[PDB]
Structure formats: structure tokens, C-alpha cells
Amino acid sequence: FSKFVRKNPKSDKFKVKRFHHIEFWCGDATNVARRFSWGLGMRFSAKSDLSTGNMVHASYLLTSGDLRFLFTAPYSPSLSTTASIPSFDHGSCRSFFSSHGLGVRAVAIEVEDAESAFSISVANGAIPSSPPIVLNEAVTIAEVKLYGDVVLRYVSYKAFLPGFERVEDASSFPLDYGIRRLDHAVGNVPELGPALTYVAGFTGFHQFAEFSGLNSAVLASNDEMVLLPINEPVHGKSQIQTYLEHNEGAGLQHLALMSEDIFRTLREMRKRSSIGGFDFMPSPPPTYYQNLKKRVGDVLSDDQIKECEELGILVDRDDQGTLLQIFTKPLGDRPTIFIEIIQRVGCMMQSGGCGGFGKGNFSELFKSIEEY
Amino acid sequence: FSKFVRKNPKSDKFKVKRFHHIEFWCGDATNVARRFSWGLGMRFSAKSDLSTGNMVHASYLLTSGDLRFLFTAPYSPSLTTASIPSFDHGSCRSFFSSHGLGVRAVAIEVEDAESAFSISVANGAIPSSPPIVLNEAVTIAEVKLYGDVVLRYVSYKAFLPGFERVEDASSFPLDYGIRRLDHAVGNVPELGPALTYVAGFTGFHQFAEFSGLNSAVLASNDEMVLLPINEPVKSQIQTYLEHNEGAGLQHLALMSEDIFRTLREMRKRSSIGGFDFMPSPPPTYYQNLKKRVGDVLSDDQIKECEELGILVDRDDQGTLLQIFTKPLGDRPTIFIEIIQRVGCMMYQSGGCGGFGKGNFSELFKSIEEY
Numbered sequence: 096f097s098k099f100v101r102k103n104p105k106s107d108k109f110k111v112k113r114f115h116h117i118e119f120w121c122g123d124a125t126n127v128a129r130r131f132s133w134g135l136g137m138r139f140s141a142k143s144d145l146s147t148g149n150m151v152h153a154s155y156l157l158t159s160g161d162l163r164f165l166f167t168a169p170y171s172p173s174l175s176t177t178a179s180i181p182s183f184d185h186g187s188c189r190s191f192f193s194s195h196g197l198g199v200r201a202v203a204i205e206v207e208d209a210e211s212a213f214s215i216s217v218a219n220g221a222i223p224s225s226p227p228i229v230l231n232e233a234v235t236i237a238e239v240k241l242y243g244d245v246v247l248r249y250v251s252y253k254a255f256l257p258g259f260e261r262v263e264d265a266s267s268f269p270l271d272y273g274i275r276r277l278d279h280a281v282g283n284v285p286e287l288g289p290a291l292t293y294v295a296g297f298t299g300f301h302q303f304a305e306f307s308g309l310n311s312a313v314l315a316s317n318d319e320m321v322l323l324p325i326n327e328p329v330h331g332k333s334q335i336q337t338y339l340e341h342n343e344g345a346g347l348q349h350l351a352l353m354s355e356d357i358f359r360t361l362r363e364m365r366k367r368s369s370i371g372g373f374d375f376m377p378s379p380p381p382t383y384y385q386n387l388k389k390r391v392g393d394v395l396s397d398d399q400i401k402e403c404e405e406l407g408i409l410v411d412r413d414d415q416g417t418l419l420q421i422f423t424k425p426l427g428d429r430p431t432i433f434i435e436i437i438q439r440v441g442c443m444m445q446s447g448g449c450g451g452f453g454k455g456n457f458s459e460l461f462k463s464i465e466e467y
Numbered sequence: 468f469s470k471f472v473r474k475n476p477k478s479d480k481f482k483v484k485r486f487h488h489i490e491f492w493c494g495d496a497t498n499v500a501r502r503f504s505w506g507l508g509m510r511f512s513a514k515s516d517l518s519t520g521n522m523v524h525a526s527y528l529l530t531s532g533d534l535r536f537l538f539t540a541p542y543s544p545s546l547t548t549a550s551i552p553s554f555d556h557g558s559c560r561s562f563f564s565s566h567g568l569g570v571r572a573v574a575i576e577v578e579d580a581e582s583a584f585s586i587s588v589a590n591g592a593i594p595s596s597p598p599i600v601l602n603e604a605v606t607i608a609e610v611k612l613y614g615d616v617v618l619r620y621v622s623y624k625a626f627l628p629g630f631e632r633v634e635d636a637s638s639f640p641l642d643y644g645i646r647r648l649d650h651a652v653g654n655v656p657e658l659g660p661a662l663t664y665v666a667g668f669t670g671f672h673q674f675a676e677f678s679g680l681n682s683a684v685l686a687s688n689d690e691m692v693l694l695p696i697n698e699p700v701k702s703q704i705q706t707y708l709e710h711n712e713g714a715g716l717q718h719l720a721l722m723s724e725d726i727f728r729t730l731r732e733m734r735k736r737s738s739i740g741g742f743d744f745m746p747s748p749p750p751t752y753y754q755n756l757k758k759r760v761g762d763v764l765s766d767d768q769i770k771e772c773e774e775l776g777i778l779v780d781r782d783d784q785g786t787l788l789q790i791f792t793k794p795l796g797d798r799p800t801i802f803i804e805i806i807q808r809v810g811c812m813m814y815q816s817g818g819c820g821g822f823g824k825g826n827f828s829e830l831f832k833s834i835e836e837y
């Protein structure tokens with residue numbers, strides 16, 4: 096008697112595969128990469144610093160399944176090229192970090208051909224940031240402006256990056272809390288309209304249909320595995336407006352990290368919150384989890400709803416699947432970028448965006464807190 | 468029969484008590500403090516950020532015993548409410564862009580910071596921040612030490628105003644045995660003008676000395692505040708100056724009540740967010756220990772040094788156990804020394820056992836064989 100109809104034109108102007116990596120720009124990459132590695136359970140797998148010959152910048156790669164986190168900091172220009180990332184600029188990293196703080200600089204996706212994806216993007220309105228550059232006849236990398244100071248990096252292959260030496264573990268069994276891949280990367284913009292027209296104008300990404308102080312929209316690729324949601328603030332206190340003021344303009348709001356077992360990951364992450372890891376936002380009242388069995392009782396057992404209450408995980412669902420989700424506190428000094436830990440249940444063939452993004456938890460949390 | 472004669476003029480131009488804190492300037496203080504907290508075992512105990520009203524800078528205080536590490540990072544100027552009145556946005560950005568993560572202030576406890584500041588400037592010291600009384604309770608002033616590092620004078624009348632305490636709220640709060648700062652060392656291009664300048668406005672006397680650098684130690688009257696300086700003679704000091712872009716603090720020696728407990732805990736966390744250590748001496752170094760420190764350390768404590776890579780040195784009066792970490796940040800500049808002094812129990816004489824100058828030959832000797 097109820098039905099939600101999804102439509103997918105599959106209008107991608109170029110062939111995109113998966114998310115490749117996320118590049119944070121830092122002031123000191125070593126302390127941030129080691130903070131994230133311990134708090135998130137990501138292995139130190141590659142690097143491109145002075146120990147490898149790179150006298151321009153220091154970059155460290157953390158991996159966990161298919162998720163790649165790159166942490167890049169600039170060296171002093173008096174060390175002069177030996178840079179392994181050709182898009183890197185000292186005056187651009189300093190300006191980015193001095194104005195936005197710790198945050199995401201590049202959102203990298205894998206494509207069939209970064210050189211073609213760059214020409215089609217620029218030809219369809221995108222502002223170019225870094226032209227296509229072929230590294231060692233193996234990898235091609237191009238960058239276009241996404242929003243604010245974030246660039247959409249195109250990555251393509253011929254068969255991590257050239258100039259990176261792989262880092263091998265000294266621990267008996269390396270770090271791993273269950274995070275396997277990036278699900279979606281969300282940015283905040285002043286006006287949602289021009290952002291959607293711009294991004295979808297050069298990517299061909301269609302809008303993913305949805306089942307507080309913001310207006311949200313999700314741009315998705317043909318297979319809906321690369322998800323780029325965007326939020327604008329609703330005025331008349333909004334976190335999006337608080338984001339833009341402390342970030343000095345638009346920027347990436349949060350990254351959702353998919354876990355093969357969100358209880359395993361939250362058990363590890365919450366263990367380390369006060370000993371170097373990441374803190375989490377306040378948990379819903381106990382009335383929230385008592386209301387779970389009546390709306391997700393056919394998906395989660397009685398012992399699994401108990402497990403969400405102990406860890407602070409929110410549950411949401413739509414017409415196709417179910418979503419387990421929780422949010423960390425801001426990763427750095429500024430109340431800007433944070434991290435979401437999710438696990439999607441259902442839509443097995445696993446469809447992209449299964450269970451939605453948790454928009455129903457706005458009222459579900461508001462309704463549950465109203466038991467006071 | 469040998470004897471080492473030490474002289475102490477006690478020429479302090481003002482009353483100096485003890486080391487108060489060390490302040491790191493960062494780009495993101497949150498990730499630097501949390502990384503140091505896990506690898507060193509220091510407790511998050513105070514803060515001054517926007518959650519407390521400070522819209523100028525974010526400052527976090529890690530403590531372990533009497534050791535105080537402050538981590539400060541600047542906010543966006545588009546946001547005074549600053550708790551550190553000497554803080555400057557245009558100075559912190561320039562500092563971190565030229566030296567990277569490093570020590571900005573070496574703070575010492577004094578009887579009167581305003582008197583210590585006036586006597587310093589009148590004796591050649593370059594002023595950095597004038598005496599400023601905070602909430603009619605604390606006075607802080609800053610003079611140039613070397614490079615962009617400043618010597619900070621702190622005095623009381625009975626951490627700092629504007630700082631709210633944060634309760635650990637853990638059953639095993641972080642503690643690896645570190646208790647206080649022993650000494651803080653800086654590298655300079657020319658040691659001569661540095662000693663003349665620093666000792667010229669402090670009255671600190673040279674601490675008598677029982678590879679690639681020339682060093683001297685400036686100590687206070689009680690020799691509990693030790694400020695050594697290094698110049699280059701291939702030299703790590705020269706490589707430091709190139710990457711640090713001038714003079715600056717080289718390392719901080721953290722005094723531990725049990726260096727074995729601390730080294731276990733720190734080596735446990737090297738690959739999971741903590742700190743890495745410099746290569747350990749060959750096994751011939753530790754086979755030669757019993758004929759060097761056999762009357763101080765037991766055989767099983769020498770075993771404990773070999774398992775942890777700890778270096779042991781000795782002088783006329785005391786014995787010193789020490790070890791060194793790798794650089795704390797991107798640049799091969801500032802590192803950390805972990806020490807434990809044995810002997811000179813009087814309630815312990817500062818600089819007991821020296822600073823490990825004898826380990827340069829002892830380490831080179833141990834590599835000769837094997």
C-alpha cells in the first residue's frame with residue numbers, strides 16, 4: 096500500500112569505478128597519521144617523505160581494507176623535483192591549512208581514464224585545479240575543483256602511487272578494527288543549488304532519492320557506489336552554518352567509513368577514545384533503543400539491539416535495507432570535519448546506499464529524547 | 468687516583484626555582500597532544516579552546532607528575548579571549564611554517580617574573596613579551612632564548628587562568644613513570660655567542676663536563692634548571708639547523724622514576740601511535756656493562772637494559788640511564804630523551820651522572836668488535 100520509486104538515468108559523462116583515497120592536508124603529517132592509525136585501526140602501508148627522497152612534501156598512507164587515508168604535510172622550501180604528487184604546492188598547502196585547518200583536500204576516485212575524465216569535466220563547466228599528469232607511464236592523475244578548497248582527483252591506471260615505498264609492519268598482527276571502505280563523502284556549501292548544478296553538471300552524476308537545520312541531496316554515479324552528498328544550511332543554530340564559519344568557507348563535512356562488523360569497530364574505537372583515539376557524539380537516551388524492536392526487530396535480534404545500546408549506535412532503514420550508524424566528534428581543533436561509522440544490511444545481489452543515509456534518525460532521535 | 472673538581476659561583480641575577488612547562492606550537496594541537504599522550508603516557512588535565520571561551524587559540528595541557536607539556540595551535544582570525552597573552556597569530560603561523568612542529572617556550576618558575584624580566588633585559592636579553600599579570604594571580608614574561616625559542620618566566624603569589632581542568636575519567640589513567648623535565652637542549656650555529664648571551668642575562672654558571680658537536684651546560688644555582696647548548700663541528704647538529712631553518716631546541720630529557728617501566732610502555736606503542744627509538748647498541752655494549760656499572764646495576768637490571776636498548780653512563784658521583792626517541796615530527800629535528808639518574812642522594816643533586824657524553828666513545832667502542 097506504500098511504494099517508493101527510484102529512477103536512475105545513468106548519465107555519467109565518464110566511466111567511474113570506486114573511491115580511491117582521501118588526502119588530508121596537515122601541518123605535521125606524522126602526528127596526524129599516527130593519531131588516525133591508532134584511533135581508527137588503519138595500517139601504515141606506504142610513505143613518500145625524506146626517507147624516500149621526497150624533499151618537497153611528507154605523505155603517509157593508512158589503509159584498512161580498501162580504504163586509503165593519505166596525510167600530506169609540506170616541507171620547508173629551503174630543501175630545494177622530488178615530489179611524488181605533482182599537484183602539490185607549498186603555498187597552496189600552507190594557505191589551505193592556515194585558513195581551514197585540518198581537513199580533506201582531495202577526494203580521489205578511480206576512473207577508466209583520468210585524462211578523458213578531466214577534459215569532459217572541464218568541457219562541462221568544471222574549474223580545473225591540476226591538469227592530467229602521467230606518473231612513470233603507469234598512473235594518470237588529474238584534479239578538478241569540487242567545492243571550496245576541496246578538489247575532485249581523478250585516478251586511472253594502465254594495468255599506491257609512484258615514488259611511494261611500501262611500509263611493512265613490525266607488529267606481530269597489525270591494526271585492524273573492521274573498517275573496509277569509504278561509503279560516502281559529504282560537503283557543506285552555502286547554497287545547495289549552484290553546488291548541485293556545478294558538480295552534477297560536469298560529472299553526470301544523478302541524484303540519489305531519499306526515503307534538521309540543513310537541506311541535503313546525494314549525487315551518485317551509475318552504479319551508485321561513489322556517493323557525494325552535499326548539505327546547505329537552513330537559517331532561522333545550524334551545524335552547517337557553524338561549519339562554514341569555522342572552516343572559512345565550503346569544505347568536506349564528514350566521511351562515512353563502512354565496517355564489516357560495526358560492533359567490532361565501535362568496541363575498538365570506544366576503547367581508545369581517551370587514550371589517543373576519537374571521541375563520539377552523545378548517545379541517544381535509553382528510550383531510543385527500547386523503540387528499536389518495533390521498527391527493526393525483523394532485522395536485528397534482541398542481543399544485537401542490546402549491543403547498539405551499549406555502544407551508542409543509531410539504526411535507520413528505508414524501503415530496501417537497514418543502516419547502522421554512529422558519528423565521532425570533530426577530528427581536529429575546529430568543529431568541522433568528523434567521521435561516520437556505518438554498516439548496511441540488506442540489498443544483497445550489496446547495493447550502494449542500502450538503507451539510506453539516516454535522515455529518519457533526525458526525528459527518531461528527536462522523538463526519543465522527548466521521553467523526559 | 469683521580470678527582471674531578473666542580474666549581475659553582477651561583478651568579479643567578481634573579482631567583483629561579485624549577486622548570487614549569489614546555490609549550491609546543493602546532494598546526495592542529497588536538498592530534499599532536501593526543502599522539503603525545505598515548506606514546507608518552509601523559510594525562511589530559513587542562514584545556515583552553517573555544518569550548519572554554521578561547522576563540523584565539525586552542526591550548527591543551529598534558530601532565531605526568533610535575534612535567535607539563537602545553538600544545539597550542541592558532542584559530543582562524545575571523546573569530547580578546549586568549550588565555551596566553553604572548554600568543555600571536557602572525558607569529559605562530561610563521562614559526563610553524565619555518566620550523567615545523569617544535570618547542571616555542573621553555574618556561575621556568577621564578578619568584579617574580581617582572582623582576583626576572585627587567586634584570587634580563589638590562590643584562591643584554593632581547594625582550595619578547597613584557598611582564599603581564601593574569602587575573603592578579605600569575606605573571607608571565609618572555610625573552611629570546613635562541614632562534615625562535617623564548618625563555619618564559621612564570622611567577623605566582625601563592626595551570627593558568629582561563630584553563631578549565633578536564634577529569635581523566637578512566638580506571639587506568641595514563642602514567643608510564645615520567646615525572647619531570649630534566650634538561651632542554653638547543654642547537655645554535657655558533658656556541659660562543661650563545662653562551663655569552665644566555666648566561667649574560669641569567670647569571671647561569673657552566674656545568675663542568677666530566678662527536679660532531681661542541682656542547683656546554685648552563686645551570687642555575689641549585690643546578691635543577693639545566694639548559695645545554697650544541698654547535699656543529701656529517702654533523703646531526705648541522706642537519707638540524709638546515710631542516711629547522713636556524714637555531715632551535717633539539718631535545719627534551721624527561722626524568723622517569725623507573726626507566727624500565729617507561730621503556731616497556733613506550734616501546735609497546737611505537738608502531739601503534741607512540742614514538743620510535745634510535746637503533747640500539749650491539750650486544751657487546753651490554754657485555755661490557757658489568758665492568759662499567761656492575762657495582763650499581765644488578766645482572767638482571769643489565770638484562771633489562773639489553774632488552775630495552777637503554778644506554779648507561781657514569782661519572783665521578785652518579786650513574787645515568789638514558790635512551791633517545793626518533794624525531795617527533797616530519798622533520799629530523801626535535802626528539803626526546805628518557806633518563807633516570809642514580810646516586811648523588813642528598814634530595815638528589817641535579818645533573819647527577821652527567822648527560823651521557825661518555826657514551827659516544829662507549830658506543831663506538833662496542834661496534835669495534837662483533
Ligand SMILES: CCN1c2ccc(C(=O)c3cnn(C)c3O)cc2N(CC)S1(=O)=O
Pocket residue numbers: 279281311312313324325376409422435452453454456457460
Ligand atoms: C541522528 C541525527 N543525526 C544524523 C542523521 C543522519 C546523518 C547523515 O549521515 C546524512 C543525512 N543526509 N545525508 C546525505 C547524510 O549522509 C547525519 C546526522 N548527524 C550529524 C552527525 S546527527 O547526529 O545530527
Ligand SMILES: CCN1c2ccc(C(=O)c3cnn(C)c3O)cc2N(CC)S1(=O)=O
Pocket residue numbers: 650652682683684695696703745791804822823824826827830
Ligand atoms: C652516541 C650517544 N649519544 C648521546 C649521548 C648523550 C646525549 C645527551 O643527552 C647530551 C650530551 N650532551 N648534552 C648537553 C646532552 O644533553 C645525546 C646523545 N645522542 C642523541 C643523538 S647519541 O645517541 O648520539
Ligand SMILES: [Fe+3]
Pocket residue numbers: 279281349351435452
Ligand atoms: Fe553520512
Ligand SMILES: [Fe+3]
Pocket residue numbers: 650652720804822
Ligand atoms: Fe640530553
